Design an enzyme around this catalytic site. Structure first.
Site, PDB file in Angstrom:
ATOM      1  N   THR A  60       8.470  24.585  40.022  1.00  0.00           N
ATOM      2  CA  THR A  60       9.079  25.787  40.728  1.00  0.00           C
ATOM      3  C   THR A  60      10.347  25.718  41.200  1.00  0.00           C
ATOM      4  O   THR A  60      10.987  24.929  41.557  1.00  0.00           O
ATOM      5  CB  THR A  60       8.131  26.145  41.760  1.00  0.00           C
ATOM      6  OG1 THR A  60       6.864  26.242  41.441  1.00  0.00           O
ATOM      7  CG2 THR A  60       8.421  27.071  42.695  1.00  0.00           C
ATOM      8  N   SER A  61      11.231  27.015  40.818  1.00  0.00           N
ATOM      9  CA  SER A  61      12.567  27.243  41.728  1.00  0.00           C
ATOM     10  C   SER A  61      12.411  28.401  42.473  1.00  0.00           C
ATOM     11  O   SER A  61      11.988  29.577  41.800  1.00  0.00           O
ATOM     12  CB  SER A  61      13.443  27.221  40.516  1.00  0.00           C
ATOM     13  OG  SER A  61      13.432  26.073  39.729  1.00  0.00           O
ATOM     14  N   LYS A 120       5.698  34.503  42.434  1.00  0.00           N
ATOM     15  CA  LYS A 120       5.867  33.827  43.577  1.00  0.00           C
ATOM     16  C   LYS A 120       6.343  34.412  44.999  1.00  0.00           C
ATOM     17  O   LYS A 120       6.623  33.540  45.672  1.00  0.00           O
ATOM     18  CB  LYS A 120       6.601  32.254  43.194  1.00  0.00           C
ATOM     19  CG  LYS A 120       5.880  31.737  42.030  1.00  0.00           C
ATOM     20  CD  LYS A 120       6.727  30.406  41.734  1.00  0.00           C
ATOM     21  CE  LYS A 120       6.254  29.712  40.228  1.00  0.00           C
ATOM     22  NZ  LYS A 120       7.053  28.592  39.857  1.00  0.00           N
ATOM     23  N   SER A 163      10.820  22.085  43.034  1.00  0.00           N
ATOM     24  CA  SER A 163      11.089  20.985  42.298  1.00  0.00           C
ATOM     25  C   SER A 163      12.495  21.141  41.273  1.00  0.00           C
ATOM     26  O   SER A 163      13.325  20.332  41.181  1.00  0.00           O
ATOM     27  CB  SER A 163      10.143  20.728  41.240  1.00  0.00           C
ATOM     28  OG  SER A 163       9.739  21.624  40.327  1.00  0.00           O
TER      29      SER A 163
END
Ligand SMILES: *[C@@](C)(CC)[C@](*)(O)[C@H](CC(C)C)NC(=O)[C@H](CCC(=O)N(C)C)NC(=O)[C@@H](NC(=O)CCCCC)C(C)C
Lengths: 196, 198, 125, 222, 233, 212, 204, 222, 196, 198
Positions: free
Chosen positions: I1-2, I33, I129
């Site tokens: 995930t960013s 998200k 991450s």
């Protein structure tokens, strides 16, 4: 540790911070991580200091004996000897080495050798704990055939960011410039690079 | 574990050794002789790990017999015990140690003195008036501290072993199936064949 | 190591080093054995070139291999000790593995095997 | 297990294979994996079989009561919210993995629910050991604005990919089609491409083959 | 015993009427870091064989050097090194299989899964798999890693049994391979968009294609996806 | 496994079951757990099937070498010690063998040696070895006399294995009987527990335990 | 270690033409030791029959529990529990102890008194209902039972023939399992009557 | 940690007639819940009228077969082209297996052929070299499903003569090659129904005094 | 995930990738998200999808009840509710939430709540991450009071690099623009952002 | 562990129980009565964990005695055994389970039949002609399978126990210090006070 090597028009430049830690304590704040294995073949060291020191010394021994018999070794050959040691002793080594060199034919070259002992010839390479934070920066800012001054600025800006975010990196930014003119040692202090 | 007792009286060393051989949930044998004659006047009893115990005793026996033939002479009990201690001390730092504890009862014909030596699996040798290996010592030593005298006859020694065996039969959890008793003196080694109901 | 073939065949088919070893035996002091119906007796001679010996400690010509077997010899004294020692070791080894002492034939067969080996091994006489 | 959901222009279809297993042994060759939350909200389960069946019936029960209490058709989002809050509470110990699909007054819906309580929304989904085989087909042939016939075909092809290529999946294909205007139609054993071939022999034994020690009549009545 | 550091993901392959196709992307991962983007994981051997390798890249490079040594050694005192006594795909494989099993038996594996694709001298298709355990198997379609779970199902729809091979063309086979690489790019988190593809044909020889990209991707439906259940905007 | 061997007035009886297991799976009901070394020597097998089978076959070869070399049949003590000492060399490696070496020689008479993978070696008159040893002991000890007939002795061995076959889950199949005398061993047949149990139950009146 | 392997035992049920069959071994052991050869694993509540394999104490406890529950059912409902409905009671009773379950493998067999329809069912230890038309198996020789049943079985067997098939499925399966056997009992069940037969088998 | 073993599934079956013997095995090869190949033969003609399968971890199975085949080759070189009798092959295989007692070949091996009297023979092997000659034997993943069926149908276990009050057993009258093939095919369809690692294809090698013959049959592919 | 959230002249923009993985398998390639907890208070979620969904739903409930009683809640208030849930349940949660919101008085605001449940008010925040790989880039490129178009370019470039290097990130780049004008959903596909 | 044996003959139940109480390396008592009378015609013997064993027994005794007073009636052996099984079955899923194995020997006055129940710590009840707990069964079950007949007299049952005890005294590794024997019949419970040298 934050280390990198960048090829450019006239040759190649190696860059590194100067911090080595045991836990959170800085055992050495003025470490020299740019290590000579031949006149114009140098390496950047990350991982176990004991391991990388032992590797580099053995490589320097091999290239001295190579030179005595067959003349000046290519940067590829140096990278091959690093790889041989790292790969064949992968179970007992924690070494991440970047090998950079200059010869007249091939110009500047960079070979990165990660933990497993694989070899990767690249236009530039980054490694060490601090490198994670500058993958984005370096990919957006690196260009091929930069000038010496441009390349020094790219490395200085890159490592300053790695140092800024990584606790395991810090101190001074050392560089080693490798060209036809010879070998040049550069150093940049905190008061310069933190301000960038 | 197996019962191994020793007692040096005035003119002899008496060794008492349990007859049981037990593996897991079954008593396989109730007449086992846990002893080897190393020379006409030297007897060794043993207890410990299943296979190691006999292999070690027989290997020692073979070596002392070899010496006897070569030199046409019986080694003293002190010399035999020192040889045994050294072999055990070697094995403790080896790949797979001998897990064997021994008592060595001998009659020194040169000194005309009986001698008892206790050696554990580490090569811990010591010369004693009485000795035990394993848990049996936890009952017998105090019993013998009280009743033992150095001038006792062989017969008084046997009475004293009976007292030790009765205490073990009362308080030890294992059924060790009685003991075989042997006397070592100036005339050699003999077995007390009627200890079951003496 | 040293592995020179010292015992070899000659053109006439003899192994001169074995036959010269026999000449060493011929020089050795006489030794005799006779069987009774219920015993065996081993007799040896002692030299008288030099006299002034201590017979208590001088090694005798008859050696016990085990309680029930004896060995005498003729030839090189030093050579005999090697055979006697090996014989005695094998005697105890036999008792350990077979749980019975050696037969006289077996002990003899062992000693004879040792001697034979030294006639076709390199570097030894 | 292979289960899939596929949205089309006027509704949503779900399908599942029919193999139930205990380790490498096949317990039930024609298990029905398509459960009902409410008349027009259907459910397919994977993971711990007891947990999927229990959690589907509990929420189904609470949904019926809610429907009666509110005098309204049950909504798929309510089933979703009740399933995920229950599962989250039990921190993944209720090993229920569900694709829930249906129609309600607000339209057609397709969600997936994992054991720890997380939910996803999509136009096509797959779960179970055969998830990757089925998804390969869905990623190769799915398009926007599918017809009912095209969605049944696609979903059915996706289950087949699981049947043939996954060892945890096999036997038949069950399907349920939920269309906005109409009643939901459950198509039990929509395909039967794994019929056991005729055996080589009959193993019916001659009477008296089995030895008997004792015999008696059992009393049921009272 | 070891652990893989720099890794390559799926290698996928299938046979068609006149030969075999094999593909693999150009990524060398370092855990979840997509570290190296110019890594060739298809190794041609002569004009009749391509070895595709997944797993540890340091080991792949070692295997790469073994294959070059095999070619050199085969040409020693061999006047027919480029004719009757040239290396067959079957020889390359059997050699690799031997090494893989001996290394696993020494408790020191080459941490890889290998697919040897090629055409034998008699014209027959060669396609066989071997991995770090020394396990070998042949099938009309073969794939490693995620390719086994996602590519095989799609490739098996084209060639489901041996008899489907003469009916399948290069064009149909290649399209099926290329579609599978797109599917792996969708659902494998250690995959790259860039890949290499190799065709070995009993008539047209070895055709090696570099710098391919996954194209014709469907993403537009993502705009309509909002929330995770109840959210509307 | 259950195996037993005992000495008596008329020599040695040897009896074994024939069941093999891997966990709770019954691998075989027809395993020969007696090995015929020579006409005067037998060995029993319990524990690791391959370990017993392999090393007792090897023992046979070593015994045959002894005959050729010494021009004389090997003693039971010597034969048992070959195996004992071999097993001892492997101690710790994980060999699993419970073994009885049974035979007759002129020197020794009828003799039995217990040998196991711990390296234990025991001469004795009665031994039961294996997972069902205890069950066999119960029936053997409570009916054993030195002065049994060859007929009664054979039956006792058979009945003691049957006892273990019945109560021990990992014992069963059939009973194999042997009798060792000065003249050598005599095979007294394979007796399937499937028929042997019901035959014994009826004729003896034992096993009221069971629904008859 | 495994509570399902301490005592041993097997249960198997089969449908036939207007009939069902359910059978079990009689063994009760502790690891290698056989303790009882009288330990029956089939119970019945009215016309509904329940086999239970696994940990013996739970077999006993569950029998008592369902006796208790089917008794109260009959007093309130004024009729006997039916197989379909009892299957649901067992399933829900088992799932009630989800995180501390009875270590059992129950099997239901019967004929519905209304429809006359043969019914069998099985469960895992937490209540997942295995409904099958052909056969249900349970216990330490379940693999063996699956093999015998799949091979021997055919649909629409008459009571006399079904007895042979189920008996021989159980017998040969038990004899490949150290922890099953020691006698066996078979129930042949019809609408009107129920016959119970004890089988002769190996006692090892 | 590196695990040097795997499990490639599948199942094998050996039955010995009066003047013949068969050794059969499915052609499916799997890893976990994926199929590696639908056709990967694991039963081989090793020469000298001996057929062999070593099932379990395939890399150990192939190695063993390979070594045994080489053993037959050298037996000819070292003993004037003498035929390797089935009993001699069996003992040879014991030593091949027991040689790796402390790092075993993770396989169940079965060989078949004729003995020196022309009678049918089957020998089956424990993973570390324990062996016995048998009338029939199943090995591999579904062995626990097929063996009891063989006990019943090949050796007539638990079957009595009708009307004899369970006192007279069914006699051991032995089977023809046609009757054996039927039992083999029925065993492999049964195992294919109930074990997820078994299916795709059946390959049977039949041994007679005239040599080795092969027959192939399709099995279900789910 | 960013994930990231960036304040700018007119308000604030939240950005995120769309990849959720279980191991190396991408379970969802079109995840959303960016989660609404109030009209103009949204959050970016990282960590356990179960945890962050459960947290967001509880927060949404609280802000709905707050609104019913006391009117529109401040972005600070939303962050506090997130913090209270994350801090007090820190043993049983694995959540990295960025909270972003626009009100008329305070303009755009960003709060980041790392694993432990601490709260940090920032001009912009990055998490997930993939964030490790863009610390360098974002630090050198962020400016305060940027325009909408500049901020969209900054988030788009940063997340393309995060996606490029992080295997756990990918798919599309979603954005949510929060200003006085309202709420705008933006999406950018691979064919665009990979070319940057 | 402790020896707990039981046998049902024609007209009585005989329970035999070992007298040893051992902790670690010492036999603390050699006259321990491992039994409680639950009612005039029901006797329970027990073996298992150190403290749990007597605490359980006495807890059951108190409950049966409480029933007896409330109802002025003696519960059947079957009823008492079912009560005991349920108590054990409760504890096995409790915080700290009772680790106790029991035999219940009783004479049913309504049936005029002797009855023996064996119940383990899990709550596994079973009715048997003879029973044992722990390792003792590994020796006795086969012995009784052979020599047991259901129509035996009490005197024959006692001869049969003698044979069981002699086998245990021969093959069990533990010295359990003999057994206390008690008989349960139509006239109640009595102790056979001379089994030491019968
Ligand atoms: C009794 C059945 C009690 C166990 C008897 O001792 C048997 C001996 C005869 C068959 C010679 N033992 C068993 O059959 C073995 C029980 C397991 C062992 O005790 N153990 C040390 C392995 N069963 C077998 O030996 C089986 N072999 C395997 O267990 C070896 C597999 C090694 C894994 C690679 C086989 C013959 C069924």
């Amino acid at each position: 540790t934050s280390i990198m090597a960048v090829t450019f028009k006239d040759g190649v430049i190696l860059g590194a911070d100067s911090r080595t830690t045991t836990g959170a304590y800085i055992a050495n704040r003025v470490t020299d991580k740019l290590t000579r294995v031949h006149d114009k073949i140098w390496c950047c060291r990350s991982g176990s200091a004991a391991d990388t020191q032992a590797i580099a010394d053995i490589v320097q021994y091999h290239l001295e004996l190579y030179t005595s018999q067959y003349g000046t070794p290519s940067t590829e050959t140096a990278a091959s000897v690093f790889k041989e040691l790292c790969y064949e002793n992968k179970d007992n080594l924690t070494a991440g080495i970047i090998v950079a060199g200059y010869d007249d034919k091939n110009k500047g070259e960079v070979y990165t050798i990660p933990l497993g002992g694989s070899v990767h010839k690249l236009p530039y390479a980054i490694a060490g704990s601090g490198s994670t934070f500058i993958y984005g920066y370096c990919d957006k800012n690196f260009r091929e055939n930069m000038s010496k001054e441009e390349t020094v600025d790219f490395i200085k800006h890159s490592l300053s960011q790695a140092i800024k975010w990584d606790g395991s990196s810090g101190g001074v930014i050392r560089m080693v410039v490798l060209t036809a003119a010879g070998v040049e040692r550069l150093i940049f202090y905190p008061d310069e690079y933190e301000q960038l | 574990m197996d019962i191994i007792l020793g007692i040096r009286v005035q003119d002899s060393v008496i060794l008492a050794s349990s007859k049981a051989v037990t593996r897991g949930i079954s008593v396989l044998k109730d007449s086992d002789d846990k002893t080897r004659q190393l020379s006409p006047h030297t007897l060794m009893s043993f207890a410990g790990e299943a296979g190691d115990t006999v292999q070690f005793a027989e290997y020692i026996q073979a070596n002392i017999q070899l010496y006897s033939i070569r030199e046409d002479y019986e080694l003293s009990p002190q010399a035999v015990s020192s040889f045994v201690r050294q072999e055990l001390a070697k094995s403790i730092r080896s790949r797979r140690p001998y897990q064997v504890n021994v008592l060595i009862g001998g009659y020194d014909k040169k000194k005309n003195k009986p001698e008892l030596y206790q050696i554990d699996y580490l090569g811990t040798k010591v010369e004693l008036p009485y000795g035990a290996h394993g848990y049996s010592g936890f009952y017998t030593f105090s019993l013998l501290d009280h009743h033992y005298r150095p001038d006792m006859t062989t017969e008084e020694g046997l009475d004293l072993l009976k007292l030790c065996v009765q205490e073990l039969e009362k308080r030890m959890p294992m059924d060790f199936k009685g003991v075989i008793v042997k006397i070592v003196d100036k005339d050699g080694i003999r077995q007390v064949d009627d200890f079951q109901a003496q | 190591g040293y592995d020179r073939a010292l015992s070899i065949f000659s053109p006439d088919g003899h192994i001169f080093q074995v036959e010269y070893a026999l000449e060493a035996v011929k020089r050795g002091t006489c030794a005799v054995g006779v069987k009774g119906k219920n015993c065996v007796v081993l007799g040896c001679e002692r030299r008288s070139t030099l006299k002034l010996q201590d017979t208590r400690i001088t090694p005798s010509k008859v050696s016990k291999i085990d309680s029930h077997v004896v060995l005498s010899f003729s030839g090189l004294n030093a050579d005999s000790r090697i055979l006697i020692e090996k014989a005695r070791v094998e005697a105890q080894s036999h008792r350990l593995t077979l749980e019975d002492p050696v037969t006289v034939e077996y002990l003899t067969r062992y000693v004879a095997g040792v001697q034979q080996r030294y006639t076709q091994s390199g570097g030894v006489r | 297990t292979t289960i899939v959901g596929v949205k089309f222009n006027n509704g949503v279809v779900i399908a599942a294979d029919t193999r139930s297993t205990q380790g490498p042994i096949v317990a039930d060759k024609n298990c029905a994996k398509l459960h009902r939350i409410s008349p027009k909200i259907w459910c397919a389960g994977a993971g711990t079989a007891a947990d999927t069946e229990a959690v589907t019936q509990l929420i189904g029960s609470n949904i019926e009561l809610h429907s009666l209490y509110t005098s309204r058709e049950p909504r798929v989002v309510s089933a979703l919210q009740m399933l995920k809050q229950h599962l989250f509470k039990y921190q993944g110990h209720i090993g229920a993995y569900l694709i829930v699909a249906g129609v309600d007054p607000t339209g057609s819906h397709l969600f997936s629910i994992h054991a720890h309580g997380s939910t996803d929304v999509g136009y096509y989904l797959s779960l179970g050991s055969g998830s990757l085989a089925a998804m390969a087909v869905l990623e190769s042939h799915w398009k926007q604005d599918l017809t009912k016939e095209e969605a049944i075909k696609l979903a059915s092809d996706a289950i087949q990919a699981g049947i043939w290529n996954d060892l945890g999946s096999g036997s038949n294909v069950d399907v349920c089609v939920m269309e906005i205007g109409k009643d939901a139609e459950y198509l039990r054993n929509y395909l039967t491409p794994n019929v056991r071939e005729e055996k080589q022999k009959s193993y019916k034994f001659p009477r008296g083959t089995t030895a008997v020690l004792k015999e008696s009549i059992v009393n049921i009545c009272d | 015993t070891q652990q893989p550091i720099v890794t390559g993901t799926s290698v996928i392959s299938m046979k068609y009427d006149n030969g075999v196709i094999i593909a693999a992307d150009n990524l060398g991962s370092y855990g979840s870091l997509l570290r190296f983007n110019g890594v060739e994981r298809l190794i041609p051997v002569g004009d009749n064989t391509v070895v595709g390798i997944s797993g540890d890249i340091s080991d792949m490079q070692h295997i790469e050097r073994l294959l070059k040594d095999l070619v050199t050694e085969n040409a020693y005192d061999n006047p027919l090194a480029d004719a009757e006594e040239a290396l067959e795909p079957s020889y390359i494989f059997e050699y690799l299989a031997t090494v893989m099993y001996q290394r696993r038996s020494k408790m020191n594996p080459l941490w890889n899964a290998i697919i040897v694709a090629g055409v034998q001298s008699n014209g027959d298709q060669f396609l066989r798999y071997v991995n770090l355990l020394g396990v070998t198997y042949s099938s009309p379609t073969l794939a490693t890693g995620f390719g086994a779970h996602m590519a095989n199902p799609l490739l098996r729809k084209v060639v489901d049994r041996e008899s489907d091979i003469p009916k399948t063309t290069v064009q149909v086979a290649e399209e099926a391979i290329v579609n599978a690489m797109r599917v792996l790019y969708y659902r494998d988190a250690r995959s790259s968009r860039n890949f290499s593809l190799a065709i070995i044909d009993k008539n047209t020889g070895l055709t090696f294609k570099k710098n391919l990209q996954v194209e014709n991707m469907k993403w537009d439906f993502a705009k309509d996806i909002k929330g995770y259940g109840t959210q509307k905007i | 496994t259950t195996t037993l061997a005992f000495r008596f007035q008329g020599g040695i009886i040897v009896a074994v079951d024939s069941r093999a297991t891997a966990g709770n799976w019954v691998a075989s009901q027809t395993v020969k757990k007696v090995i015929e070394i020579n006409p005067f020597l037998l060995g029993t097998m319990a524990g690791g099937a391959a370990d017993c089978q392999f090393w007792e076959t090897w023992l046979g070869s070593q015994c045959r070498l002894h005959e050729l070399r010494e021009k004389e049949r090997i003693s039971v003590a010597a034969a048992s010690k070959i195996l004992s000492n071999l097993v001892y060399q492997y101690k710790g490696a994980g060999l699993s063998m419970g073994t009885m070496i049974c035979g007759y020689t002129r020197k020794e008479g009828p003799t039995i040696y217990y040998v196991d993978s711990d390296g234990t070696r025991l001469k004795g008159d009665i031994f039961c070895v294996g997972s069902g040893q205890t069950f066999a002991y119960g029936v053997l000890d409570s009916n054993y006399k030195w002065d049994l007939s060859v007929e009664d002795a054979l039956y006792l061995g058979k009945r003691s294995i049957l006892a273990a076959a019945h109560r021990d889950a990992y014992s069963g199949g059939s009973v194999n009987l042997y009798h060792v005398t000065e003249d050598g061993w005599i095979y007294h047949g394979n007796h399937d527990v499937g028929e042997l149990f019901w035959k014994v139950k009826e004729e003896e009146g034992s096993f009221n335990n069971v629904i008859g | 270690s495994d509570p399902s392997s301490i005592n041993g035992g097997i249960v198997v049920a089969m449908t036939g033409k207007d009939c069902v069959a359910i059978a079990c071994d009689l063994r009760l052991g502790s690891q290698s030791l056989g303790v009882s050869n009288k330990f029956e694993k089939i119970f019945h509540y009215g016309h509904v029959f329940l086999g239970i394999t696994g940990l013996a104490t739970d077999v006993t406890t569950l029998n008592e529990m369902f006796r208790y529950k089917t008794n109260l059912y009959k007093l309130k409902e004024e009729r006997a529990i039916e197989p379909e409905t009892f299957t649901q009671l067992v399933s829900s009773s088992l799932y009630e102890r989800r995180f501390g379950p009875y270590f059992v493998g129950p099997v239901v067999a019967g004929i519905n008194s209304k429809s006359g329809k043969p019914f069998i069912a099985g469960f895992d230890l937490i209540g997942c209902i295995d409904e099958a038309k052909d056969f249900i198996v349970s216990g330490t020789a379940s693999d063996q039972l699956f093999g015998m049943c799949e091979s021997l079985y055919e649909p629409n067997l008459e009571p006399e023939d079904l007895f042979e098939t189920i008996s021989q499925a159980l017998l040969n399966a038990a004899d490949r399992d150290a922890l099953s056997g020691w006698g066996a009992v078979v129930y042949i069940i019809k609408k009107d009557e129920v016959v119970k037969r004890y089988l002769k088998m190996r006692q090892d | 940690q590196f695990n040097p073993y795997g499990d490639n599934g599948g199942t094998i079956l050996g039955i010995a007639g009066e003047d013949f013997a068969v050794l059969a095995g499915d052609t499916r090869n799997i890893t976990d819940y994926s199929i590696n190949s639908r056709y990967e033969p694991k039963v081989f003609d090793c020469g000298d009228n001996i057929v062999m399968s070593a099932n379990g971890f395939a890399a150990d199975g192939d190695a063993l077969v390979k070594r045994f085949k080489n053993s037959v080759k050298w037996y000819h070189f070292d003993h004037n082209d003498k035929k390797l009798s089935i009993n001699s092959a069996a003992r040879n295989i014991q030593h091949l297996l027991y040689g790796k007692r402390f790092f075993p070949y993770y396989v169940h091996t079965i060989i078949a052929g004729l003995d020196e009297d022309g009678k049918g023979a089957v020998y089956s092997f424990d993973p570390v070299g324990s062996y016995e000659r048998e009338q029939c034997r199943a090995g591999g993943a579904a062995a626990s499903l097929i063996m009891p069926f063989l006990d019943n149908q090949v050796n007539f276990k638990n079957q009595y003569e009708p009307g004899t009050n369970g006192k007279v057993k069914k006699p051991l009258k032995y089977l023809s090659v046609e009757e054996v093939i039927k039992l083999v095919r029925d065993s492999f369809t049964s195992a294919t129904e109930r074990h997820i690692q078994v299916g795709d294809g059946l390959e049977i090698l039949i041994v007679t005094k005239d040599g080795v013959r092969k027959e192939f049959y399709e099995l279900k592919r789910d």
